[model samples]
Target: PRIRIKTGIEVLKEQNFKCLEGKRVGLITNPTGVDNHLISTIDILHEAPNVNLVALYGPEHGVRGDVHANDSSTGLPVYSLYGKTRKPTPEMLKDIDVLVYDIQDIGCRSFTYISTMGVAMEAAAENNKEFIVLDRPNPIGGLKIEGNVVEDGYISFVSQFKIPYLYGLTCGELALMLNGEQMLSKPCNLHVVKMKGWKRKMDYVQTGLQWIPSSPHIPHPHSAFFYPVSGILGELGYMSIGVGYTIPFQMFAARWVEAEKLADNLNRLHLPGVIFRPMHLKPFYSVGKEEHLQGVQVHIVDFNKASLSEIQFYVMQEVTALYPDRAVFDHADKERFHMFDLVSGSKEIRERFSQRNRWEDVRDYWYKDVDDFRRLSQKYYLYK
Candidate 1:
């Protein structure tokens, strides 16, 4: 049976905007906020009969998604959540009655869109306005939650909420978790317009939806899958996770790295869902364009069997083994937790890497928390 996949916006239109009729709606969305027809959510809401879209809000990579900014000519006043105020201030929402949030999140805890949602929900609750989430599929699928949970004080822009690295929850699912877990400052009237055909085990490709770039680095669907694997490594000052190159996140290289040696070892682990290929390239842009670099390019062959967090653990383990002396384990300004610790959600992981602890034990350390997460987050599951 060919399941008709209808997104939240599609569902709203199909329902004739019954819930939102006569409400002055303010949308928190970005370029990925489009229907299956590739129509903008802003356009859909604005055109919906009696559903007054009073203003537009943008997250990290902007509204229109041109780098980090958007294009809005409706003269509806696009307010940026990525800029000066990470949350919607009183002035931005004074005239708004209800807040509508719709964006494609990459499912990584540190991705920041979920954080934006938390704060937006907070703003809505504190201001006595209703908030609605136009749910989307978890592009990385809704199963296989992994990685360490963010402890207190590590909630930076990257690691905002208390979740694992690969959270395996869609925007709406995470929204429910945030609201239910009391991550929001205050309680808000939260509602989620769920998707029709999204299944927990089905990847984004199975949803039969176009894969839009969630951010600047994740240009390809492959890159999106590779992110949670190589994202923590990208924080390394001495290495390059191929950020400025053609295959961002899919490849990691450094001048000191022995490509074949790293590849041989990574492949030897035989990590499920991914394979490491030895390759060398001159970045010509970010992460050392001056010299040719050598390292392994990660190829995800099977999403179902993949453990991205495990890949991350092995990558760091291998790097530590190869260049213990040359490698600066963490960032220089170590006084505060920067990208290195922030990305992992704990300094203990970095310390373990530096101490050359067993990778299996390191992987086991996070499993406990992720197990607890699965139990807690499953309560908010909106799909099968």
Candidate 2:
């Protein structure tokens, strides 16, 4: 039975904002700040009584997360958690008495929304302000965690903590773990307003809430499943993860990538459920934000049994083989860091890929990490 999920906006509508009536409030939000009716929290809070929307804290692609990768725009400080500064600066938090974070996360380690929340909590702690995370449902379903432990030294914007590629925890729960157990500089006055009716296994479709584009590339749930592959494919040549068009992320195109042949290769994997349409696209950010590239229109032919990382690994095996002439993981940065290795997690796949490796021969290497992740994440999981 479909039930109303108590999102932050839903709880806020219940007059919780009145608790901080005299205090100035700032919001860390993005395009996914919508409620059940698609009304953004920014506009909603602007009209809500006693709450002062003093400043806006933008993440990877600014407040909208709509811009392309590396498009970190700034009006005020706009403290970028994606680029040079991964933490919120004290300058930006000066006027904020309380910071409310409300963004939908894609439930992947590489996704930066959770990291932005961590950085915000750090700022709130340093400045001695209250921090609240208005929780949302994990779209990929919170129960299915995958991938490996981020090597302690290889922590970047994507892999900030020792987490699996598919870390199962939501943004709110992750913040709590990072503060309470991870032991940062100082823990802030943290409060997580969880989704009241959400269950551990509920996907976004089951959460009874409206969908808003969380990031520029992820226009649909299908996009999240392909993002890891799309991000890796991005290393070799310019491909459109569907930037300018109505559908982003699902549009996989490149000048040299033969979509039809690639589709056949991927289809043979028999990835439980998904459909592929050979097509073309031009990005609105990278080399061909205006030019044309031929590729496949990735469709979620199936969702019930589709696994993201498994599909991604299989996709890499196919694409790398299809366009061997154009495929180039060769880099100066491969100081124990190869292309897919950098994107996926560790030096496992890429190290082998460099030595003329095959995904079929190496697919077994993934299970160990997945097992390790399952054991480690048992502690922080909020859902049953």
The local distance difference test score of each candidate is 0.81, 0.68
Question: Which candidate's TM-score is highest?
Answer: 1
Report the lDDT tens digits of candidate 1 across residue range 1-384: 243578888888888878787888999988889987789988888777678888888888788765452344676887788767889999989988899988888888878888898888999999999999988878788887887888896777788888888888888888888888888678789999988988888777777788788887887666668888777766764577878788888877888889999998888887877889998898878787868899888888988888886676687678657776654454323543367788888877777665653477576667768778889987999998
TM-score of each: 0.94, 0.80
| Candidate 1 total steric clashes | 1
lDDT of 2 by residue, 69-146 (tens): 221332323335557665777877788899889998888877878878887788899899999888877777776666
Q: Which residue runs of candidate 1 sit more than 4 Å off their true CA positions?
A: 1-4, 66-72, 330-337
lDDT of 2 at 140: 77
